[PDB]
């Protein structure tokens, strides 16, 4: 009854665990990454990381460790979903079909038991005899590993020590022995148990218990020959081996707590340690005591390799290359060239993978195209906090502009000594041909000696062997290169008109009637050595070599594509291009990572095909609607390698990563013809000619999404776009250590202390107060700011620093009342640690004019201003629990108008028109309405349900979407048609989902060119949203019939598509809460529905047995297996 459709427009980017081993093969060194529902498998190489396969699994990954049981060559993979969907995967490839088969699978959840506060822990016996799991406190779950254990039957083992911090298996033991540290009222101890599968219970450990630091955190097992375990805390690193005990208390690790570790040497002689704030120690083990052959330690020295990104999971590749993952920074590849020591730091960055997460807030901005929005997310945190700009498609930076009467063809011309620089541009009208020679920016037309004046030119190229050819409708005219005069002319034997012509370096073939003529270009001459007749008229042809192994021609009267040897009439193969229309153009190049051949039909489709080097023809049947008009394909040198420009109604640069092809739509309204432009004044340009005018310029990239980064070195909180001043406004928070003499010292030079005009707030309206607990030396204090950033240069123009012990929460940029200026309005909130609930707050109103941030008005409120919005020029702020509506007086001073007191904390404010939506963390969603006549608030509906709500958004006057606890989504709809007051006063719950990602903010708009061309709308909205991990989804409404059809198709897909780990889709998307779980309703999985185009045609055939995809008249239950594809393609266009 909700009919929404949630789709992912960006894969999650936060890394939450990485591991290395031999997975894809018995000799490769693989790197596996959970990012986070997506497993990325790489192959380590001397140059970097080579991706192999992407795989989406129906679950959040929380355990990932490789093991090699006896007999197997390549290591398996054990994955434990956050929903407790265990599996044991295994890489399997047969030539091309790379598949992740599931050797065993099952569910390890228990009916009763509170999940441990320390979270899931998964460890594996070094001998690969069993797998340990600590899912619930005081219950150690063991999964035996055997060839006949397909259901993963696990038996619990009772643990007396409830509070277990970290547990790992030890090396060099007969029976599998575990070693863990547990918290008890006495302190923190370390205990060892011997696990026996026959008894199904623990036994006496190898060495008895001991005592460690009060804040010992993690256990790191040391392998043979050393044996034993090492326990590292906040102060010291202790090594235990029974009767052998080493303790070291270095003064380097005092600053921060070690959180993640790694091993580098196979024998454990060295280790990596990365602390919280983002520096990388390295633990070294001294094996200098070979007392009786066995190796024993003597020292436990520690070193420091410098600073990197904020580490969350290290991993060591070969030849001293470390992949420093990060849940909130940027994943890095640092080289441990420890023998260089350039400035005391040992690491040197090599790569930096983009990571949008965490996202705290965003907005939609019309930046360049004025028709498509762009997303500005406040990514990062701590010392990585930065702005990101997201846009759809590539862009071309124009260098020159010129207008022509509807150009219908263009081609570079060179009339100078060979220097790879083009000085002339040859245009082509419907019948006229203007040869414009412009060394600089000239527009005059000067026909060449061999160039005709008006002949409707079909080709204009630069031939080899010192020639310059210009083929027109009448005949091909050859002009010498150095003489620059017409020296040859080979008219058609029948003196007829040539329809299709192709120009190569040394060969030229034109189409005369239904026959094909081939002419070979000689020094200052042309000779024809081939002639043939085709069954039907040739719609188009293209021969791309010296000697072309084969040439392709499309049958206009047969709508079929065929290839044949270029210097003869020897056909090779043929295929039918659907029969809809004659092909418009055909081309073959290495744009699609292989020597593929592409043919474009007159209906706007583009059937991809794959050719070979000598002689090879395939089908590769795939009809993707690149446009709604005939498309001309041309390849430009200024690309990654070559790429292909598929000029059409929506021009797209046809890309293919390494084996899968996706059309990356360009940010242009329409393009009719294009050609590469290599000019001395504008190198690597691309002369694009539309139906109106022409222009040239270079392309940006070939990526689907471009993510510009603006580092700030400080965590941003909120953001807004002020249109009038054409600048942003963003808060921040920089951590500064308390000074010994009284004051604060900046930790690092950030973007708040490096602004142009940096002021400091001095309006001590609220002052005095109490702070008896003086901030001791070494304490951390947060200092807030308000940065002003220009849109098209991204440099902090102003940095207004707020008062001491003042916290800024809200931020809005809007005009108020009848005032014509636009003001920044920031609602801050005073705080001291002694008091829990803030009592004093400010509502300051800035105005950025002439490069200086000047305060306009000030207002003090007894409370904390949490969120603020705008009503028709009236500012609404929610102080503590109340809701206050302000009026902007003519004298520039806020004035309260009406109050409404709630028993909940008015913390989330989202509004449209008159309805006011209020909520809080406990998901106490509430509604209000503002009647202008009374000028007082009224309550329309309420909904209270205990749950950790995250964010809320208005989809319409009826639907109230919002995330909540356990990564879910929900939709609340008010029944305005209810008969009684009570029924209409309650918010019904209609939609439920398990997104699996913690949403942070919701914003209207879409990153698609919605400028015009609204040929109706299946989807009726777009609501972007970011998450902590990094994905940017899109929730859009749908019609009833469309929702029912998509639900039927989704239920049919689940019986066909094989999920990795065999996790049922209905179980993955089920609305999951710690206390209850019910199936998801009212939502359509965008990822699964759009996967309908990836499965092969036969699978689609079984999927579409019934009974829809047509209008109500008849309903065409057969659906023809193609009608649903048109439905899916429409749904893909929204993002």
């Amino acid at each position: 009854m909700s009919y929404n459709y949630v789709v992912t427009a960006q894969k999650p980017t936060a890394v939450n665990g990485c591991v290395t081993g031999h997975f894809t093969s018995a000799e490769d060194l693989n790197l596996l990454i959970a990012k986070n529902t997506r497993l990325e498998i790489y192959v380590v190489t001397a140059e970097g990381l080579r991706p192999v396969k992407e795989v989406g699994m129906y679950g959040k990954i929380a355990v990932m460790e490789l093991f090699r049981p006896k007999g197997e060559s390549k290591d398996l993979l054990f994955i434990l979903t956050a929903k407790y969907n265990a599996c044991i995967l295994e890489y399997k490839q047969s030539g091309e079909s790379i598949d992740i088969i599931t050797r065993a699978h099952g569910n390890v959840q228990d009916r009763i038991g509170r999940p441990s506060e320390t979270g899931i822990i998964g460890i594996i016996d070094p001998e690969c005899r069993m797998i340990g799991l600590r899912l619930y406190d005081g219950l150690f779950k063991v999964i035996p590993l055997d060839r006949d254990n397909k259901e993963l039957k696990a038996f619990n083992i009772r643990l007396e020590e409830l509070h277990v911090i970290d547990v790992k298996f030890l090396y060099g033991c007969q029976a599998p022995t575990i070693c863990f540290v547990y918290q008890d009222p006495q302190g923190r101890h370390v205990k060892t148990y011997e696990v026996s599968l026959r008894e199904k219970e623990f036994n006496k450990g190898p060495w008895k218990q001991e005592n460690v630091e009060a804040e010992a955190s993690m256990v790191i097992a040391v392998p043979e020959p050393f044996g034993g375990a090492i326990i590292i805390g906040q102060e010291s690193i202790t090594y235990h081996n029974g009767d052998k005990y080493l303790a070291i208390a270095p003064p380097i690790i005092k600053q921060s707590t070690i959180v993640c570790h790694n091993r580098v040497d196979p024998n454990g002689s060295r280790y990596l340690l990365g602390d919280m704030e983002g520096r990388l120690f390295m633990l070294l083990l001294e094996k200098e005591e070979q007392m009786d052959g066995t190796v024993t330690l003597k020292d436990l020295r520690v070193e420091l390799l410098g600073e990197t990104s904020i580490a969350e999971c290290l991993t060591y590749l070969d030849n001293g290359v470390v992949f420093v993952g990060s849940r909130l920074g940027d994943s890095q590849l640092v080289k441990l060239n420890v023998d260089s020591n350039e400035q005391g730091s040992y690491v040197v960055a090599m790569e930096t993978f983009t990571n949008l997460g965490p996202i705290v807030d965003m907005c939609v901005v019309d930046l360049e195209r004025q028709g498509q929005g762009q997303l500005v997310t406040c990514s990062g945190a701590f010392k990585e906090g930065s702005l990101r700009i997201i846009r759809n498609g590539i862009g071309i930076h124009e260098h020159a502009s010129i207008d022509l009467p509807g150009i219908k063809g263009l081609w570079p011309l060179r009339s100078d000594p060979n220097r790879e620089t083009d000085d002339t541009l040859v245009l082509s009208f419907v019948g006229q041909t203007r040869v414009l020679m412009l060394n600089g920016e000239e527009v005059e037309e000067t026909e060449l000696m061999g160039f005709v004046d008006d002949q409707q030119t079909f080709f204009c190229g630069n031939v080899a062997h010192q020639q310059l050819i210009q083929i027109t409708s009448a005949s091909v005219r050859l002009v010498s290169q150095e003489p620059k005069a017409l020296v040859s002319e080979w008219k058609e034997p029948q003196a007829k008109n040539i329809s299709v012509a192709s120009c190569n370096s040394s060969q030229v073939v034109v189409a005369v009637g239904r026959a094909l003529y081939y002419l070979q270009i000689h020094p200052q001459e042309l000779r024809q050595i081939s002639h043939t007749e085709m069954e039907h008229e040739v719609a188009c042809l293209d021969i791309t070599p010296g000697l072309s192994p084969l040439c392709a021609i499309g049958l206009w009267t047969d709508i079929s594509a065929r290839i044949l040897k270029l210097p003869s009439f020897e056909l090779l193969h043929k295929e039918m291009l659907g029969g809809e229309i004659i092909p418009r153009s055909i081309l073959m190049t290495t744009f699609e990572s292989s020597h593929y051949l592409l043919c474009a039909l007159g209906d706007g489709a583009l059937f991809y095909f794959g050719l070979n080097i000598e002689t090879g023809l395939l089908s590769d049947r795939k009809k993707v609607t690149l446009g709604t008009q005939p498309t001309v394909l041309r390849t430009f040198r200024s690309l990654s390698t070559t790429n292909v420009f598929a000029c059409s109604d929506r021009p797209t640069v046809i890309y293919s990563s390494n084996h899968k092809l996706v059309f990356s739509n360009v940010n242009l309204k329409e393009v009719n013809y294009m050609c590469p432009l290599n000019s001395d004044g504008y190198p690597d340009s691309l002369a694009l000619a539309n139906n109106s005018t022409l222009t040239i310029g270079t392309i940006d990239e070939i990526q689907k999404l471009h993510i510009r980064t603006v580092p700030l070195y400080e965590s941003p909180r909120k953001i807004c776009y002020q249109e009038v001043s054409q600048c942003f406004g963003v808060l921040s928070s920089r951590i500064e250590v308390q000074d010994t003499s009284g004051g604060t010292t900046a930790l690092r030079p950030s973007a708040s202390t490096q602004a142009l005009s940096s002021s400091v707030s001095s309006s001590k309206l609220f002052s005095s107060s109490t702070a008896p607990h003086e901030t001791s030396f070494g304490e951390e204090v947060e200092v807030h700011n308000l940065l002003i950033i220009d849109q098209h240069t991204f440099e902090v123009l102003h940095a207004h620093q707020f008062l001491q012990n003042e916290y800024a929460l809200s931020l809005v940029s809007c005009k108020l009342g009848k005032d014509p200026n636009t003001y920044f309005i920031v609602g801050t909130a005073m705080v001291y640690p002694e008091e829990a609930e803030p009592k004093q707050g400010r509502i300051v109103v800035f105005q950025y004019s002439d490069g200086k941030l000047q305060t306009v008005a000030e207002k003090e409120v007894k409370g904390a201003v949490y969120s603020m919005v705008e009503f028709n020029g009236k500012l609404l702020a929610s102080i503590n629990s109340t809701v206050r509506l302000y009026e902007w007086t003519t004298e520039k001073e806020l004035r309260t108008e009406c109050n409404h007191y709630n028993n909940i904390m008015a913390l989330y404010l989202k509004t449209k028109g008159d309805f006011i939506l209020v909520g809080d963390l406990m998901r106490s969603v509430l509604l209000l309405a503002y009647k202008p006549m009374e000028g007082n608030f009224e309550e329309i509906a309420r909904d209270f349900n205990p749950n950790w709500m995250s964010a809320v958004e208005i989809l319409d006057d009826d639907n109230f979407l919002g995330a909540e606890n356990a990564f879910n989504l929900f939709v609340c709809q008010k029944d305005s048609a209810a008969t009684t007051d009570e029924e209409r006063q309650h918010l019904q719950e209609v939609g439920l989902f398990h997104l699996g990602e913690f949403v942070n903010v919701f914003c209207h708009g879409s990153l698609v060119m919605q400028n015009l061309g609204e040929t109706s709308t299946p989807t009726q909205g777009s609501v972007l949203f970011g998450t902590v991990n990094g994905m940017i989804g899109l929730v859009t409404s749908l019609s009833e019939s469309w929702y029912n059809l998509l639900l039927d198709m989704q239920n049919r897909l689940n019986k066909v598509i094989k999920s990795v780990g065999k996790i049922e889709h209905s179980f993955w998307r089920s609305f999951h809460t710690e206390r209850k779980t019910e199936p998801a309703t009212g939502f359509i999985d965008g990822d699964l529905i759009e996967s309908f185009l990836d499965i092969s045609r036969p699978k689609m055939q079984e999927v579409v047995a019934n009974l829809q995809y047509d209008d109500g008249s008849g309903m065409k239950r057969e659906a023809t297996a193609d009608d649903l594809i048109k439905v899916v393609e429409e749904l893909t266009r929204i993002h």
Partner: protein, 349 residues
Amino acid sequence: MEEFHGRTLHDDDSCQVIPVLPQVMMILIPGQTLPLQLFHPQEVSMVRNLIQKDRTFAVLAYSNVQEREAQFGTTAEIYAYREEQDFGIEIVKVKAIGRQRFKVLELRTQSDGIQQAKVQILPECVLPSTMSAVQLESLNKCQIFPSKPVSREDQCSYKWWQKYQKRKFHCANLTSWPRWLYSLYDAETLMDRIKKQLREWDENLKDDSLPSNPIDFSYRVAACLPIDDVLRIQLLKIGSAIQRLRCELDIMNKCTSLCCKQCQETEITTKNEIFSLSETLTVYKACNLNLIGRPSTEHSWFPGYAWTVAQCKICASHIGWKFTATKKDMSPQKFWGLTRSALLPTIPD
């Protein structure tokens, strides 16, 4: 008394029908014992039948006593009951303990005399840690705490709780809200807030006088604090431990007016007037109090403050002492150190 060892735990969201004793008319929060003695033969027979069947009773707290209509109630289980025939009248004394909250869907009067009502047992939903959703995989091991140091020597306990809030809510930097906000939704922090704020009104040792389970602690503090009946019903409406604790904080901060302990009406001071110049609460001003004796400054706890006895005007019982300045140029001139035990407090109305 006939002891009972069984425990009753009805299924959540499962409708149950049981008669309600007409004698009970007050709000009984779960966990608070409400002994009652019934002399009516019909009531005694009904109690005996209930004890034989399931030892369960329903106490429907009517919103209006005259209307006798209850939209909410609590289910109680008899722990120990004694049937003593005193003076020829069947008298049964039972000390019962509350079991769970219930919502009265409909109330009907049985022919025998009792009232039969079908009530669905509302569930007690426990939320997980507010930071568990966005918790980091690396930082789980740091959640476990280095014991719980506590002592009167630590006094303020400022540094420990600052470390607690700073590192427990470390992951709050990834979410749009700051750590000091989630501290308002944390069970332990709220429990400390009640425990510290209660000790301002009594000298009970918070270590053992109150439970540690958030639900049990919330019920105990809700029963203990002085409050009217309508706000008791309002608290009973709340079904979440965190929400109930927040409501208790909201109510508690509105008790700005103190009063004589066994006197009710005579207000003695306002919370805003507490002048912590330098145990016993110090109030700058006072009202409805009369001085007693003479300023015998001998062995004065506050140097320069000649102390004189003070008492409630309406009772003449001692409520504190008036610390009069021993010098002309001494400030404050007069500080009233009212006794902590002697105060209610109460709402400002």
